[PDB]
Design a protein around this ligand. Sequence first.
Ligand SMILES: NC(=O)c1ccc[n+]([C@@H]2O[C@H](COP(=O)([O-])OP(=O)(O)OC[C@H]3O[C@@H](n4cnc5c(N)ncnc54)[C@H](OP(=O)(O)O)[C@@H]3O)[C@@H](O)[C@H]2O)c1
Ligand SMILES: NC(=O)c1ccc[n+]([C@@H]2O[C@H](COP(=O)([O-])OP(=O)(O)OC[C@H]3O[C@@H](n4cnc5c(N)ncnc54)[C@H](OP(=O)(O)O)[C@@H]3O)[C@@H](O)[C@H]2O)c1
Ligand SMILES: N[C@@H](CCCC[NH3+])C(=O)O
Lengths: 300, 299
Amino acid sequence: TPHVIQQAQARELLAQIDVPQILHKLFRDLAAGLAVQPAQQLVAFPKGAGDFINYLGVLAEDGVYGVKTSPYIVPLVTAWTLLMSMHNGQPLLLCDAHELTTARTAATTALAVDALAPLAARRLAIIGSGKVAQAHLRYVQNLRDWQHISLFSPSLASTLAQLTGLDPRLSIADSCAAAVADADVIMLCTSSAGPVLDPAHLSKPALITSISTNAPRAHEVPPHSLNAMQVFCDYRQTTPDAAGEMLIASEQHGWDKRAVMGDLPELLSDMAYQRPVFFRSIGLGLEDIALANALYQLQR
Amino acid sequence: TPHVIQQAQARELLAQIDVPQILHKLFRDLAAGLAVQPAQQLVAFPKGAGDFINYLGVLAEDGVYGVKTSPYIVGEQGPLVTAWTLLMSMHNGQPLLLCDAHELTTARTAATTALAVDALAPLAARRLAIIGSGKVAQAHLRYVQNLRDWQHISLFSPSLAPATLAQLTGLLSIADSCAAAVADADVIMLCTSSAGPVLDPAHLSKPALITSISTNAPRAHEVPPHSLNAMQVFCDYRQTTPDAAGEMLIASEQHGWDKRAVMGDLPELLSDMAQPVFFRSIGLGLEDIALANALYQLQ
Ligand SMILES: NC(=O)c1ccc[n+]([C@@H]2O[C@H](COP(=O)([O-])OP(=O)(O)OC[C@H]3O[C@@H](n4cnc5c(N)ncnc54)[C@H](OP(=O)(O)O)[C@@H]3O)[C@@H](O)[C@H]2O)c1
Ligand SMILES: NC(=O)c1ccc[n+]([C@@H]2O[C@H](COP(=O)([O-])OP(=O)(O)OC[C@H]3O[C@@H](n4cnc5c(N)ncnc54)[C@H](OP(=O)(O)O)[C@@H]3O)[C@@H](O)[C@H]2O)c1
Ligand SMILES: N[C@@H](CCCC[NH3+])C(=O)O
C-alpha cells in the first residue's frame, strides 16, 4: 500500500463491480448515520486558469475515508481519489476516478429512476449524448419495459450508430420537444448552465432527473418550476444549499427546501403522479469514496 | 508518476532542502498574491473516533497544487496522527507525488516558528525557554539557535523533570518546572502536544514573545484563550487561522476578543506590512505543498 491505479486498470476493475448495488448500500448506510458526507471545497486558480474541487466521504463502517480531487484546467478535467485508513491513518489507494465518476452519477440517477418511476413506464427521453448520458442509458435500459427511448443533443444532426447501438429501441429525435413528447421519464444529462426543459411544456406528468453541475448554479429546469413539481434529490442535507435551481427558487420564487419529499437515503430505506416528479443529483463525495473503496477491496 | 515516497525516503530528501529558504519565499509569494492559501477543513469522524484535517495550497508559480490529509485517530492514552500529501499537476491534472509528510510537517512547523521569532523577537534577546521536549520541540531548538545571541536556553516537559539527547547535544538547561524554565525568558516557545493551556502569560515576571503550535485536538491551544486579550497577537495567516486556531475561536466566543486585533501575520511581517507578544501557528497547506513540491523536483 498504497496501490496506484491508472485509468486502464481502473476501468477493468470498474467492470467487475456492481455500482448500483454499492450505491444502494451506501445510501441506506447514510440514512442510518453509518456514513458521513462532508462539505466540498472549491479553490480557484489565479488568472482564470481554472478551479479544483475536493469531494470527501467518511465510510465509518468500512474504516476508510477519502478525497477526490478534480481539477478543471484551461478545458481539461480529471479526477483522482485518495483512500485513507481510519484505523492507522495510512493511504490505501490512489485511483484515477474519471470513469468511476461517470458510473456513480449515472447509477445514482438510476437508483432514483427505479425508486420513483411508475412501474408501468414505457417511454424514455434522454437529453444529452455524452458519456454521462450513455452511462445513464446503460444503467436504466433494464429498469422498466421501455417500448420507446428517445435521445437529443444539438450536435446530433451535424458516430450516430454508436448511440443507436446501445439499445435497439433508441432513435435520434430532431428536437427536445420531440424527444420528450409523451415521455414517462426524462433524463437531463447535459452540460447546460441554464434550462433545457420547461415542465409546463409537457403533455403529461413525467419523472424528470437532472445532473448538470458545470457552472456556478448550473441548472436544467426553470427554477420557478420546482414550485409545480414533486421534488426529490440525492441528499436532503447537502443538495438544496448548492443546486442552482434550488437556491434560485428559494431566493426568488419562495420555494422552501422542506418541500423536498425525499432523498435517496429516505427512498431506499422506505422513509420517503398527479404532478410531475423532479429528481436532482449534484454528485456526493460519498459516491466517489464508496466506489474507490470497492476498487480497493477488489484490488486485494 | 505518481511517485510514492514513504517515511525513510522522505526524511533523506528533507535533509537536502532548505526549509526556511522555501518558507521565506513562500510567505512573500503569498503576500504578493502569487499563491492561494484556502482555509483548512476539519471533518469529524462519527462517534468520537477522531477527525481529519485537509490542508490545501495552489503553488501557481511551479504549476502544482495539492492536499495534505492528516487523520487524528483517538486512542487510549494518546491520538495516532499521520499526514500524507498528494501533489497534483496544474498543467495536465495528474498526480505527481504522494508523500509521507510526518517529518516534513515537523520541519515546516519549527521553521515557521523560526521565521516568526526572527521578525518578532528583540534583536537583543538573550534567554530562551522551550515548553515540550519531543520531536517538534527538538526541531524548534535547532531552527531558532542562530537567530539571536542566546546566552541561556531552558527546556521543560513533565517526563524529563532518548531521542532528545539526540537534540540536547544537537546544539543550556532542563528545568524541573514550567515556572523555572521561563523565568526571565525573552522568548517562550510552546512546543507541546497539549490540547489545553501549558502556560499562563499572566504569571510571567516580564513581557516575552510567546509562540504556540499545538494542533493535537480539534481546538488545541497552549495558553488560556482569555490571555489573548492581554497580548499583542500575530499568527501565520490572518485570513484563515483566526477561524480555526483553538484559542482564537474560544476567545472570540466567550472572552469578547475580536480577530481584528491580529496585529500581523507572516506574509505581512516578511513584506514590512505589519506592526507581551503571542504568535500562533496551526499549519498551512502552502507550507505542505511547497515542501512536497521540493521532493518532487528532486526526482
Ligand atoms: N451530478 C453529478 O454527479 C455530476 C458529476 C459530474 C458531472 N456532471 C455533469 O454531467 C454533465 C455531462 O457530462 P458529459 O461528460 O456527458 O459531458 P459532454 O460530453 O460535454 O456532454 C454534454 C451534452 O449536453 C448536451 N446538451 C443538450 N442540450 C443542451 C443545451 N441546451 N445546452 C447545453 N448542452 C446541451 C450536449 O449537446 P451537444 O452535442 O450539442 O454538445 C452534449 O451532448 C457535465 O457537463 C457535468 O455538468 C454531473
Ligand atoms: N509532530 C509534527 O509533525 C507537528 C507538526 C505541526 C504541529 N504539531 C503539534 O505539535 C504537537 C507536539 O508534537 P510532537 O511530535 O513534539 O509530540 P511529542 O513527541 O509527543 O512531544 C510533545 C511534548 O509536549 C510536552 N508537554 C509539555 N508540557 C505539556 C503539557 N502540559 N501537556 C501536554 N504535553 C506537554 C510533552 O511532555 P512529555 O515529555 O511529558 O510527554 C512532550 O514533550 C503535536 O501533538 C501537534 O499538535 C506537530
Ligand atoms: N502529524 C502532525 C499533524 C499534521 C498537521 C499539521 N498542521 C501531528 O502530530 O500533530
